[PDB]
Amino acid sequence: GSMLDNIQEYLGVVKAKLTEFYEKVFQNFVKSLFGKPSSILFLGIDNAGKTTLVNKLKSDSTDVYMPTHHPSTSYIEIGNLKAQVIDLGGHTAARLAWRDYFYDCHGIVFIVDVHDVERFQEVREAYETVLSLEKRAPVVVLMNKIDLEGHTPETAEADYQWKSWLSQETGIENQEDPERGQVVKIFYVTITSGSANSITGPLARAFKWLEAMITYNNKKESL
Amino acid sequence: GPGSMLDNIQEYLGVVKAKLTEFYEKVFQNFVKSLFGKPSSILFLGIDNAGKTTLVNKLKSDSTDVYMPTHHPSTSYIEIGNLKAQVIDLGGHTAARLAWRDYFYDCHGIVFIVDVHDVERFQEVREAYETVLSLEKRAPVVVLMNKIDLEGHTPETAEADYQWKSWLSQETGIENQEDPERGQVVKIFYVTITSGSANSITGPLARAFKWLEAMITYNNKKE
Amino acid sequence: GSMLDNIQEYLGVVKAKLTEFYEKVFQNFVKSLFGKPSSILFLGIDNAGKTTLVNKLKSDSTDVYMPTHHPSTSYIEIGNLKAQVIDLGGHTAARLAWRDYFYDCHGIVFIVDVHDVERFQEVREAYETVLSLEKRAPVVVLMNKIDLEGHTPETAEADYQWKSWLSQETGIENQEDPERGQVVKIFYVTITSGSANSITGPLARAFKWLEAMITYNNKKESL
Amino acid sequence: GPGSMLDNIQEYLGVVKAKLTEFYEKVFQNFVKSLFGKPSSILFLGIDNAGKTTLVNKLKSDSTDVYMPTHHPSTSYIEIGNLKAQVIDLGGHTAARLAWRDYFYDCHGIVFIVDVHDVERFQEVREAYETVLSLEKRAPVVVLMNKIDLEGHTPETAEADYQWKSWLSQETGIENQEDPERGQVVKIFYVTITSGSANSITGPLARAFKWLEAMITYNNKKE
Ligand SMILES: Nc1nc2c(ncn2[C@@H]2O[C@H](COP(=O)(O)OP(=O)(O)O)[C@@H](O)[C@H]2O)c(=O)[nH]1
Ligand SMILES: Nc1nc2c(ncn2[C@@H]2O[C@H](COP(=O)(O)OP(=O)(O)O)[C@@H](O)[C@H]2O)c(=O)[nH]1
Ligand SMILES: Nc1nc2c(ncn2[C@@H]2O[C@H](COP(=O)(O)OP(=O)(O)O)[C@@H](O)[C@H]2O)c(=O)[nH]1
Ligand SMILES: Nc1nc2c(ncn2[C@@H]2O[C@H](COP(=O)(O)OP(=O)(O)O)[C@@H](O)[C@H]2O)c(=O)[nH]1
Ligand SMILES: [Mg+2]
Ligand SMILES: [Mg+2]
Ligand SMILES: [Mg+2]
Ligand SMILES: [Mg+2]
Secondary structure (H helix, E strand, O other): HHHHHHHHHHHHHHHHHHHHHHHHHHHHHHHHOOOEEEEEEEEOOOOOOOOHHHHOOOOOOOEEEOOOOOOEEEEEEEEEEEEEEEEOOOOOEEEEEEEEHHOOOOEEEEEEOOHHHHHHHHHHHHHHHHHHOOOOOOOEEEOOOOOHHHOOOOHHOHHHHHHHHHHHHHHHOEEEEEHOOOOOEEEEEOOOOOHHHOOOOOHHHHHHHHHHHHHHHHHHHHH | OOOHHHHHHHHHHHHHHHHHHHHHHHHHHHHHHHOOOOOOEEEEEEOOOOOOOHHHHHOOOOOOEEEEEEOOOEEEEEEEEEEEEEHHHHHOOOOOOOOOHHHHOOOOOEEEEEEEOOHHHHOOOOOOHHHHHHHOOOEEEEEEEEEEEHOOOOHHHHHHHHHHHHHHHHHOOOEEEEOOOHEEEEOEEOOOOOOHHOOOOOOHHHHHHHHHHHHHHHHHHHH | HHOOOHHHHHHHHHHHHHHHHHHHHHHHHOOOOOOOOOEEEEEOOOHHHHHHHHHHOOOOOOEEEEEOOOOOOOEEEEOOOOOOEEEOOOOOOOOHHHHHHHHOOOOEEEEOOOHHHHHHHEEEEHHHHHHHHHOOEEEEEEEEEEHHOOOHHHHOOOOHHHHHOOOOOHHOOEEHHHHOOOEEEEEEEEOOOOOHHHOOOHHHHHHHHHHHHHHHHHHHHHO | OOHHHHHHHHHHHHHHHHHHHHHHHHHHHHHHHOOOOEEEEEEEEEOOOOOOOHHHHHHHHOOOEEOOOOOOOEEEEEOOOOOOEEEEEEEEOOOOOOOOOHHHOOEEEEEEEEEEHHHHHHHHHHHHHHHHHHHHOOEEEEEEEOOOHOOOHHHHHHOOOOOHOOOOHHHOOOEEEEEEHHHOOEEEEEOOOOOOOOOOOOOOHHHHHHHHHHHHHHHHHHH
């Protein structure tokens, strides 16, 4: 009996260090994606998971939130990522108040709570608001909280009925051809899962796609 | 480059974390086999859907322990080292209170499992428990109030919710009798059998088995 | 460049936890070897590695050295292991001063520094002293510091010339048959290596052999 | 039982620790490949037995980098990403100071390695260094005083031993010239190339390469 003493506590301590390490790799990978300072707007209605995502990207040691004066906004510099977070509302013409935030905007991360179906009308208005203020920058869409529908990223990608219904209710559609103008790509994620830190998982591939599209814009504007 | 090296680091960290998790479970399995120094007939009892098969699957080692075919669909049997585990699905209303009497021959201890969420079936639980106590008047009885996670409880917050503990005893008829000098003993533990922490050899689930073994040893000292 | 930041520090932290864990398993395995309190004498001339070995076995949290008044002796209780350490000297008839330490002695660990060849005469006298004061208890011999000869336990075991020369110079010979009287078995170890914590390595097998021989004595004295 | 479970835990901890050690080395290898953004001819120089082949083997990735056959037995050549590593074993007394001149065409930097323990060959080192400086009058020179472990030094205690540092400079003729405004630059680093900590991307060995790359970039800014 005494031979099992503390074995489990050591397994737990090691597992905890492995989890911190796993998260650190994600933070490093994302921080290294942006070679020049890039203004990224994290947008969506409240409770979608924006603050959760930005907290996932930041290093608690080096990155510090800056005070904004509007309660709907957040700002933190994560290496070259200048992350501006905005809780949208929708269904208002006072959307022009935010126009300054889209000056020299490099990319957008738009987050949707797929579980909060009743607020899909706000989402489509919030999304319509974004597309009218920013007409050039790439938009990556995170369909978040798929775990609340019992989905992983793999089973969600195969649920073609549900993907069509989500696009129908929010108005968000893919436009993955950069020759055809502004680009939009939808990803299905659970931002709070531990596997979301995988640098080959959908969340990380969404940032790699966004970065590649920002690089396409920077090369096209130079020619 | 370095990108392919960090993906290999992350993939390896996950493989290791899963293997350490498997070891954490094996420690629980070895702890249980070492509790019983002589062959002991333990009856795992309760109405169906309470978590009996789940608990016994958690106790067994998939390599060496094999379920044996029984004739009744309500019964299961597996030898886990010296733990001779007899599982019986009780339940429903019936005048056949004697139907299971033979299974109590040379019974050493009872694990009685209750689903604390299924409040509608508490009358079946109360009848099942009364049936058990009328067939076994000597062996120690450990009561697992299971599925406390469905009430938003951990084992720690469950133990402090004296109001809820009294209500469970009132509705099922199950009461503590922890004095071995006063006759047959009963002790209630509050657990979530499907949780990973249920594998902790210092957790309530493991303390319930250590308490049961200590009571079986106390009884054997008198005999 | 920033993508490699702190990756190495995490690999080092995890490796350090793995090393502590590896050592803890050895401490648990050895502590569990002795089911009843057992007086084990750790003997040899000074600088052989006795204090190093006992420090390797103890848990710094629970096990505490007790003050002795002779500077040549040490005593610590490690679970059921009552470890009495004595720096021998040899070449003196005042060896009878230590006779009390061999009353109810259960086993002996005799340690030799294979590198300190010039002091082999003290070792043989120290060894002769031991065999004259204790004529019943099993003796396990650790030929220690084999790394200073460029040996691992495997290459040392194959160096039959050097094993013969060590036995010739110290007078220590094997007697592994318990029917033929007192038993002696020689093991080749590097007590300071990390692999010496392996519970299937020579150091651990030496303690398992000693325990089995003590059990043979206890069964023979009961018949 | 539990004994076979702890041996499997220990064996697994060792397998993991070795794989983490391999990853620690791969981080060093990736760090070196990422230092050189353009093809750079680096000459690794010194008398034989100084540690040149050991250093270059530490830099290369065994999967992708392959030594190419040279015609002289004193020379080695391997392309490690953009690092074009030319190794030349200098040494002995000779009037053939021009023999290696062709290898200095388009030379970008020099790594000159000295064995600090082989004091008898310090005159060969001094002649080798004088030969090098007469063939290359522009490229930055990083000097690795290697094998400091044989003097009982770590990189930290070596840096504070100003008496020993002055003696090494006096006996080999190697002096620091860290001002790039004052012409060709030389910087001395104190390392143990065979140690595992030599893989640290914040250690002296890695700082020597970062210093050399910074000097190559400073030179290229003028050209
Ligand atoms: N189940 C689940 N909850 C999530 C997920 N992402 C975020 N949340 C939760 O959603 C809540 C609101 O998130 P938050 O980042 O504060 O929202 P926002 O800043 O207003 O967009 C928090 O309790 C998060 O833990 C997800 O993928 N799954
Ligand atoms: N939420 C929750 N589900 C549980 C728990 N224990 C068991 N279950 C689930 O309850 C269901 C019935 O369990 P089972 O072991 O088959 O019950 P049995 O009829 O008593 O053998 C299964 O789907 C289990 O996964 C628990 O602690 N929490
Ligand atoms: N190289 C080497 N040194 C060892 C080994 N075992 C012990 N030592 C060293 O030997 C020295 C004396 O050991 P110690 O335990 O103090 O000796 P004792 O108590 O007088 O027998 C210490 O510096 C130990 O680190 C070994 O296997 N290899
Ligand atoms: N002790 C010690 N040995 C080293 C060190 N670096 C290299 N060596 C050893 O020195 C010997 C000669 O090294 P090598 O790389 O072949 O030298 P080269 O002739 O300059 O190519 C080898 O046996 C290496 O293991 C060091 O830092 N410390
Ligand atoms: Mg927020
Ligand atoms: Mg069942
Ligand atoms: Mg000592
Ligand atoms: Mg060489």
